Nucleic acid binder design. Structure first.
Ligand SMILES: NC(=O)c1ccc[n+]([C@@H]2O[C@H](COP(=O)([O-])OP(=O)(O)OC[C@H]3O[C@@H](n4cnc5c(N)ncnc54)[C@H](O)[C@@H]3O)[C@@H](O)[C@H]2O)c1
Ligand SMILES: [Zn+2]
Lengths: 212, 50, 69, 108, 165, 185, 22, 99, 98, 213, 97
RNA sequence: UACUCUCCUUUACAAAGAGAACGUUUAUAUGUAAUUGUAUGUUUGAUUGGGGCAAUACUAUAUCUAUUUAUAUAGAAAAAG
């Protein structure tokens, strides 16, 4: 028995139905929203509470996209109201082998950390290092030496917001990774690709003309 | 709570017929939508002189 | 009339691509399976390449011993 | 599908609507495994165009325990070895023991 | 499925393009009243059914029961006609067919009087030479209906074929 | 599109059409399919304006509305009706165009030799047309379906010496003495 | 490529439903 | 009189050493003997039996009957699939067409 | 799903879904009812940007409403009645890129 | 042996005797260029005989055509052409795409000219641009199409605009491929242009290999 | 291997210069000698571009800051009009083209 | 119901991938643990072919011969081979 059947999720607008569930956070599977508050109020009522300048703001057609689920197509215009299967695909397709290789993520070190075995620096303080995915999770993060290098982590610390595109795309094959290492070697560690670093060999005399 | 309170095999009258349209089906709340009466379908379609 | 001149026929040094005694020879439609499509160089090889497929349909060229075929 | 060595990218099909059989099923959105259907009924090219995936969750949505982000137990139709029998099987995702350090509650 | 729905009302009468296999050879007195009342019912039973659906579905979409959104309400407030072709409304048809009947009726009385101009210009107080029956006997019923257009009696036919007088 | 003599845009190739004004054509078949087409556009407007006259009081409650849902009538007017006007207009031109030529032919022709022979030069009076139009004039064939009544064959049917019978009720009754039919072998 | 033959004649036909005079 | 002409029997398997003037009897469009004409063309007659004046279905689809399906008073409103759309060239779409 | 919004018969009939040989804007506006629609096409807009939604998206123009010019089907349908009406389409045409 | 693929040129035969029989009977007007609309709407040919390749004029036993007759049909037979052309007529073979086949038969549904796409490439090869049929593009093809871009060299004579600032191969792999090809094929004149060594055997890339001219 | 055409509107992260980069027609790997890995990962990858570069790093060179990076946020073309229509006519000369 | 020879749904063995925290996915394998189907036909236990001699009969009758040829479909040869 349902005493006080809840009101529809996003019924907050005066002369158009609430957006369908799922889009607001609810159960998918139905396209067209409907709220008995809106359909009962006679037309003049719905035209009383609203001026023309307003209906043109809630008539507003955000046609393919969804105004609420930012970035995903409106789920009353898809073939069926469920979420877009294609965007949220599981990382392994129905037949491929799981050859997702070892991936190294960027972490912002928070204390000057200095290895005592290689006698050099895991990382300075407040500089993002690409560390292993199971050093970070199991050794660097539990102790407070590091955090992830996400956009908002930069915001919280005081550093210019840098987009490492942290796991923006996972590679499902080693040579599909060793290309992603080539992309990330360019954007992140860009000083490797300057006309000054491609010529440390030659900032002075070609070595065959110097003294001995 | 939004669900309809009966195993939907009892309210299957709503889901297969053309009541698929005349009914709210958000998360299985098989509740009728608004529906004009016949005193109004002609009150709204004669006042337009349609 | 116009005195324009044209030869009687067009001789193209092109060679026919359908020999009556060659098996998969012919001019196939624009959406037929091109010569040895999916075969990968082996007799009925498109069957052998089925286990290699990632995921097939639910009704996919299964077992069918030519019985009254 | 074209036969030249170096096919530079272009706006449209350079040599007419792409020829071949597998280009026939890609020209309609289907995946290239439609080339291996024996019957392609109006339901079949619906079934395999992935309009709505034939793929479900092991337990109820309400009783679900292990965090399955966006996954189902998709069934993979395999065709057997030398004599091509078609059988299908339900392939799960790989659940790892997520032993994290959520620094909110300062403990693993 | 697809059942020629674009033909339901597009017939010339009410009993057309409605597949009703349930017929009979002789539909009796009240089976005919039941029939005619039936065709129109499932012609108005269908319509107001299909009107309540469109008017209710439109009302649930927040817009006027005939689909008129905020725009086509705002234009009519301005006087700018919002529909390209204003098909003639019920006031039209019920008037565009109101005079035509007012015209025929004033033409009948215009013509009822007209034929009397020619009927009384028919001096024949005796039947013409169609009153022959050398081909085959006249019809006694008809003569009784043609007696009015004469003075001399017509129905009285002898046992013999008519001579002509 | 073609549908009239203007030539479809497929005279992209500048195909001219010389030796014109060459034919007088009475537009016989086209005026036929015009009267057929003009009947449709009127037989369509009749439908687009069907409005409930419920001669019964059971379902009288709609006697003011049209017989078609407003969205459908707003379609059928545009799908089938306004199409049928174009299809009516097309014949209303393929004929109004062909007449323009005939108007020019029937002047430049009337002069040369006769204003009497003219509408004979442009006639189609087949010698038998009396068969189809004024069959009372036609004799040269026997084209009745009830041929045994053609005046040249009326002498087949027998002229019975009939009579009335007041004792039977004015029933006509033939005075032929029936011939004793064949009976046995 | 313009349309030389019958260049007019598109605007001169189908006096729609001839009025009271004709 | 409809022959179902077929090709030679032995035209791909074993050629070396066969007779010189019989390696070519395999090249002519020979009729199949009528004892098989009637067998195969029997599955085509069944289309409307007991109707002594309908002809059998033909092997290939003649050009006029394909349209005969869409020349029916019920198909006159299907703009697509009419006048030949299957056997038409592949449809052309907006340059932005995409799935 | 115990309730499917639409049977597979109408998940698999794209003709009721796609924009192909099917008008997707029901209302046909008059002359002045268009010059008053284009009044809200904002300066800086250009048809060369609003793209065709993919096949998997339904073809539905909910009509002339707020920001209708972004509804690719409302735009190119209004753009077509401005032809039959004779209104001068100021904005640019679909630029097929090469 | 007689398959019809997607795009086959199989045309229903409109015997010239039929068309000549109508024009005197009075179903067809001899003045108006008798495009297939007239043939369809005058009940000369029905719906069940006009499929996508529109039709084909066949001079069947017609030894003579008496009056100047103009036609816009699809692929007349060479005799049928030389019969109309003798009597002062024309025949501009329209070879419309299917999208054009509709808008010619039911133009009462297209209030304005909705642009028509050129036919398939296979049609342009054989009818639309081939002056032997007086195809409607036999004027355009020679006038505007058959000329390359004013910048194209020898290799890029087929690109809408020459994709490089120089005819020659652009990079190494376009070169070594063409440096090997021009010797894989014995050194022919035009063999510089690399071509794919595999014949798809498609019917679309099939043009009349032998025939009249 | 994209059979169908589609143009994205990539927004840089360094200058937020909304530049558009299209995706032409690149033909399917040959089916005549089929290869199951190169095909079924050509297709599955094609849905991932067709859904607005879902699981891929975008690598195109900017037009404003002439350099190639991987920082682009792929704008759905009604998030683009959300942006384009909401920029003063001068910055449209700065961030757009 | 059964096993060296046929074949899947198969849960075991091995490889790989995850700083391998254990569950999955593959590849290669195919087990009578595997429940599929075949295991003949004709004369009685051998024979299966195309000829010929035996009254221009031939049950297999009786004898023998021998490039007397193995049609199609996928592969193999791309001109006529
Ligand atoms: N195969 C086809 O697509 C086909 C077949 C028959 C007719 N048509 C014609 O297509 C036209 C529409 O153009 P489209 O084919 O690009 O698709 P479309 O119908 O989507 O065209 C855009 C819009 O134009 C409007 N429109 C169409 N005809 C109109 C008219 N006479 N007056 C006012 N508004 C009108 C409608 O709102 C339509 O949705 C229609 O007029 C129709 O008769 C096309
Ligand atoms: Zn940038």
């Amino acid at each position: 028995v349902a005493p006080w059947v809840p009101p529809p999720r996003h019924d907050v607008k005066v002369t158009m139905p609430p957006p369908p569930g799922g889009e607001v956070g609810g159960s998918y599977g139905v396209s067209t929203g409907y709220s008995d508050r809106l359909a009962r109020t006679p037309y003049w009522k719905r035209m009383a509470l609203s001026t023309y300048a307003l209906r043109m703001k809630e008539n507003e057609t955000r046609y393919p996209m969804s105004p609420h689920r930012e970035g995903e197509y409106d789920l009353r215009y898809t073939v069926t109201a469920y979420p877009d299967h294609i965007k949220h695909r599981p990382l392994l397709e129905i037949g491929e082998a799981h050859q997702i290789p070892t991936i190294e993520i960027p972490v912002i070190f928070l204390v000057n950390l200095w290895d005592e075995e290689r006698l050099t620096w895991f990382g300075r303080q407040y500089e993002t290092v690409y560390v292993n995915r199971n050093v970070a999770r199991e050794e660097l993060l539990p102790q407070r030496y590091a955090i992830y290098a996400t956009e908002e982590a930069y915001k919280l610390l005081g550093l210019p917001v840098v987009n490492h595109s942290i796991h923006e795309e996972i590679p499902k094959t080693p040579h599909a990774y060793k290309k992603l290492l080539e992309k990330q070697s360019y954007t992140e560690e860009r000083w490797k690709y300057t006309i000054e670093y491609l010529f440390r060999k030659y900032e002075a005399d070609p070595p065959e003309l110097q003294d001995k | 709570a939004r669900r309809v309170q009966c195993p939907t095999e009892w309210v299957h009258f709503r889901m297969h017929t053309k009541d698929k349209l005349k009914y709210d089906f958000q998360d299985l709340a098989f509740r009728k939508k608004f529906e004009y009466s016949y005193e109004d379908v002609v009150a709204n379609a004669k006042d337009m002189c349609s | 009339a116009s005195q324009r001149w044209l030869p009687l026929q067009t001789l193209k040094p092109m060679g026919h691509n359908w020999s009556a005694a060659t098996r998969s020879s012919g001019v196939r439609g624009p959406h037929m399976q091109l010569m040895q499509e999916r075969l990968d160089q082996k007799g009925f090889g498109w069957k052998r390449k089925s286990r290699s497929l990632w995921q097939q349909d639910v009704a996919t060229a299964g077992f069918r011993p030519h019985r009254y075929f | 599908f074209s036969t030249f060595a170096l096919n530079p990218e272009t706006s449209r099909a350079p040599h007419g609507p792409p020829r071949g059989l597998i280009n026939r099923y890609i020209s309609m959105g289907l995946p290239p495994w439609a080339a291996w259907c024996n019957r392609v009924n109006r339901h079949a090219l619906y079934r395999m165009s992935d309009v709505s995936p034939r793929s479900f969750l092991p337990k109820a949505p309400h009783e679900m325990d292990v965090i399955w982000m966006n996954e189902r137990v998709r069934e993979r139709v395999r065709t057997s070895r030398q004599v091509q029998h078609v059988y299908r099987q339900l392939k799960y995702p790989f659940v790892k023991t997520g032993i994290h350090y959520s620094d909110t509650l300062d403990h693993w | 499925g697809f059942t020629m729905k674009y033909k339901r009302g597009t017939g010339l009468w009410d009993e057309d393009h409605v597949n009703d296999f349930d017929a009979n050879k002789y539909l009796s007195a009240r089976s005919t009243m039941r029939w005619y009342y039936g065709m129109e019912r499932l012609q108005t039973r269908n319509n107001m059914n299909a009107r309540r659906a469109t008017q209710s579905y439109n009302n649930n979409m927040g817009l006027h029961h005939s689909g008129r959104g905020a725009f086509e309400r705002e234009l009519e407030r301005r006087g700018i006609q919002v529909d390209k072709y204003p098909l003639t409304t019920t006031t039209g048809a019920a008037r565009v067919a109101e005079m035509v009947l007012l015209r025929r009726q004033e033409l009948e009385a215009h013509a009822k009087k007209a034929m009397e101009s020619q009927r009384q210009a028919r001096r024949r107080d005796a039947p013409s030479e169609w009153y022959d029956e050398t081909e085959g006997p006249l019809n006694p019923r008809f003569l009784a209906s043609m007696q009015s257009n004469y003075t001399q009696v017509i129905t009285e036919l002898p046992s013999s074929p008519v001579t002509g007088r | 599109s073609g549908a009239v003599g203007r030539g479809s845009f497929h005279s992209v190739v500048a195909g001219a059409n010389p030796r014109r004004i060459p034919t007088y054509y009475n537009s016989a078949y086209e005026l036929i399919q015009l009267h057929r087409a003009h009947r449709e556009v009127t037989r369509n407007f009749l439908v687009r304006d069907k409005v409930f006259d419920n001669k019964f009081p059971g379902c009288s409650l709609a006697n003011g509305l049209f017989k078609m849902v407003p969205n459908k009538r707003g379609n059928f007017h545009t799908r089938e009706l306004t199409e049928s006007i174009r299809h009516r207009t097309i014949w209303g031109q393929r004929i109004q165009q062909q007449r323009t030529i005939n108007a020019a032919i029937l002047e430049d022709a009337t002069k040369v030799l006769s204003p009497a022979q003219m509408e004979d030069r442009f006639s189609y009076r087949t010698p038998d047309a009396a068969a189809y139009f004024s069959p009372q004039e036609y004799t040269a064939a026997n084209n009745w379906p009830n041929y045994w009544q053609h005046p040249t064959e009326k002498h087949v049917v027998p002229k019975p010496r009939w009579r009335r019978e007041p004792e039977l009720g004015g029933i006509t009754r033939v005075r032929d003495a029936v011939a004793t039919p064949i009976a046995d072998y | 490529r313009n349309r030389t033959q019958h260049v007019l004649d598109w605007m001169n036909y189908d006096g729609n439903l001839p009025t009271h005079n004709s | 009189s409809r022959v179902w002409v077929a090709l030679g029997g032995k035209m791909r398997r074993r050629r070396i050493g066969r007779q010189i003037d019989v390696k070519d009897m395999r090249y002519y469009w020979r009729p199949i003997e009528p004892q098989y004409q009637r067998l195969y063309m029997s599955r085509l007659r069944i289309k409307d039996h007991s109707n002594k004046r309908v002809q059998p279905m033909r092997l290939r689809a003649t050009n006029n009957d394909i349209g005969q399906a869409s020349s029916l008073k019920e198909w006159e409103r299907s703009s697509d699939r009419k006048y030949g759309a299957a056997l038409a060239p592949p449809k052309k779409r907006d340059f932005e067409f995409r799935v | 799903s115990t309730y499917n919004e639409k049977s597979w018969l109408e998940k698999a009939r794209w003709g009721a879904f796609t924009k192909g040989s099917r008008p997707v804007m029901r209302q046909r506006y008059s002359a002045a009812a268009l010059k008053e629609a284009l009044e809200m096409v904002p300066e800086g807009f250009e048809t060369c940007d609003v793209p065709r939604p993919p096949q998997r998206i339904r073809a539905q123009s909910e009509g002339v409403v707020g920001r209708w010019y972004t509804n690719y089907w409302t735009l190119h349908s209004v753009r077509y009645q401005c032809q039959l009406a004779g209104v001068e389409w100021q904005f640019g045409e679909r630029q097929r890129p090469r | 042996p007689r398959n019809r693929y997607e795009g086959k040129a199989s045309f229903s035969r409109l015997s010239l005797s039929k068309l000549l029989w109508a024009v005197d009977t009075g179903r067809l007007n001899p003045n108006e260029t008798i495009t297939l609309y007239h043939l369809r709407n005058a009940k000369v040919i029905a719906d069940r005989e006009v499929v996508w390749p529109g039709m084909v004029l066949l001079a069947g036993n017609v030894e003579r055509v008496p009056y100047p007759l103009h036609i816009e049909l699809q692929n007349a037979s060479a005799k049928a052409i030389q019969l109309l052309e003798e009597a002062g007529g024309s025949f501009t073979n329209v070879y419309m795409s299917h999208e054009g086949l509709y808008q010619e038969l039911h133009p009462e549904e297209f209030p304005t000219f909705m642009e028509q796409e050129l036919p398939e490439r296979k049609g342009l090869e054989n009818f639309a641009t081939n002056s032997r049929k007086r195809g409607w593009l036999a004027q355009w093809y020679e006038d505007e199409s058959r000329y390359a871009h004013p910048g194209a060299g020898r290799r890029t004579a087929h690109y809408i605009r020459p994709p490089t600032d120089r005819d020659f191969p652009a990079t190494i792999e376009e070169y070594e491929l063409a440096k090997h090809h021009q010797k894989w094929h014995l050194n022919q004149p035009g063999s510089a242009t690399v071509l794919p060594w595999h014949s798809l055997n498609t019917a679309d890339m099939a043009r009349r290999s032998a025939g009249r001219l | 291997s994209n059979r169908f055409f589609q143009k994205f509107y990539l927004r840089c992260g360094n200058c937020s210069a909304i530049q558009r980069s299209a995706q032409g027609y690149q033909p399917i790997a040959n089916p005549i000698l089929f290869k199951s890995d190169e095909h079924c990962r050509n297709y599955h990858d094609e849905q991932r571009r067709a859904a607005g570069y879902s699981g891929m790093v975008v690598t195109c060179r900017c037009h404003r800051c002439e350099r190639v990076h991987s920082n682009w946020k792929v704008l759905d073309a009604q998030q683009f009009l959300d942006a384009k229509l909401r920029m003063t006519p001068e910055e449209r000369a700065q961030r757009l083209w």
